[PDB]
Amino acid sequence: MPAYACQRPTPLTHHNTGLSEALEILAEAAGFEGSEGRLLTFCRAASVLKALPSPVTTLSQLQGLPHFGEHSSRVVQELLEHGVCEEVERVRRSERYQTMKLFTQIFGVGVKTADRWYREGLRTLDDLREQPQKLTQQQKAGLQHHQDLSTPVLRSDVDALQQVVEEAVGQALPGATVTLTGGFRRGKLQGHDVDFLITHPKEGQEAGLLPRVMCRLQDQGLILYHQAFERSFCIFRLPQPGSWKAVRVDLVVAPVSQFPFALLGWTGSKLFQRELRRFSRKEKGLWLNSHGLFDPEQKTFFQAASEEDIFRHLGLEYLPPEQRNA
DNA sequence: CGGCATACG
DNA sequence: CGTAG
DNA sequence: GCCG
Ligand SMILES: [Cl-]
Ligand SMILES: [Mg+2]
Ligand SMILES: [Mg+2]
Ligand code: NA
Secondary structure (H helix, E strand, O other), rough: OOOOOHHOOOOOOOOOOOHHHHHHHHHHHHHHHHOOHHHHHHHHHHHHHOOOOOOOOOHHHHHOOOOOOOHHHOOOOOOOHOOHHHHHHHHHHOOOHHHHHHOOOOOOOOOOHHHHHHHHHOOHHHHHOOOOHHHOOOHHHHHHHHHHHHHOHHHHHHHHHHHHHHHHHHHHHOOOOEEEOHHHOOOOEEOOOOEEEOOOOOOOOOOOOHHHHHHHHHHHOOOOOOOOOOOEEEEEEEEEEEEEEEEEEEEEOOOOHHHHHHHHHHOOOOHHHHHHHHHHHHHHHEEEEOOOOOOOOOOOOOOOOOOOHHHOOOOOOOOOHHEOOO
């Protein structure tokens, strides 16, 4: 088992679901406390289990696996022995975990804001609704739409959204293309937002495109919330039988020269991208982001025509999106 | 021990 | 500070 | 919390 998540296939569904879920609770709690290193280790250990070819049934099977030391191994041992891990259950039940989870799920609210509200005594969404003057316009939107944004998006919904985005993009710039990215591109049947990447085959033509796209979607009455720019974090009106619901949609524009890098980054998973960028820098001495891949010694950027190019540049076996579910 | 990804709005 | 993967 |  290789130590980096980008060196191994990780399917969406796997053989150690309960164990991985438990480790991800501890990772999430670590993030709520600002412990980014512990969050990363628990996330990585969880991801190792997702990559295994069969269920872990005994503690012995963890020996030699990367990112399993005394703490993560103890969690797995308790789950194997008793079906529950007392540490995990205490987190789940805790008022701090539950409230930080609720608050950070609000669009516009991060860990820092959630933690401040927690220390001020706030615990519920209606607590926040009762002092709306201390809310940003983005938080106001997130709170008004919170209930809809909590219900998953289906692949049917995505197809309908992609058609309306394509219509707007086509008027904004004929020839521009719309690619579904994010979790749906990794094979998810549901998601909590939809991600699209927009480019144009003629380099430079995409400059200034996103404002034109957003104006057209807004004129069509489809935009419930949004803020020169190249990423737009929107709330869209999605038709439903006899009504509609709010859906988070991210729109991103990239020049075609950067499109493989942007496609790679926006397809995720988050852990996969962090691991790929860590691998690039620490093992290959190259600097990776969603715009390109830089050689800091020759001071040159790699050209890529495909994601396959990027994996080859980094000396990694190619993984399709469905195997990037780290 | 230091390191832990790297952007944009 | 928020957002993204 | 774990790795190198
Ligand atoms: Cl930490
Ligand atoms: Mg997404
Ligand atoms: Mg998104
Ligand atoms: Na949030």
